[PDB]
Amino acid sequence: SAHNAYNAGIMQKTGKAFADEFFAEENQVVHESNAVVLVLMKSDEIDAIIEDIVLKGGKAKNPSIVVEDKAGFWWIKADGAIEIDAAEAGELLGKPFSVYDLLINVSSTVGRAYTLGTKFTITSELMGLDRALTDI
């Protein structure tokens, strides 16, 4: 879990300590990561999804999820994949809510993200290469 914090690892160092790790020779190539990053714009609907889906059922199925408050948006990082069912969001909110309505306030994806049925998924998997995309 703590490896997915915004300020994990090198980010906790300041001053010279930061610089020496930033310029270390091990850190001049990218390091493959199994994480995904999801950014949700703050709104009435999103704040309910955060509290009653992501931080309850979501964290239960994926204990690696970290959610951070960045004032205008929620920053979310997890191992592997995050999944949000628009049909469950609609029941929580009490109003019609398709996957396209969910996308109204999904603001960024660092990962492979896709829509299938009522489900929005952001995954570390290389969709279209390692696993095929499908129709309904």
Binding site: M41, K42, S43, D44, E45, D47, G72
Partner: peptide, 8 residues
């Protein structure tokens, strides 16, 4: 105003 701006 209510659901977007003031909620944020």
């Amino acid at each position: 105003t209510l659901l977007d701006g003031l909620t944020r």
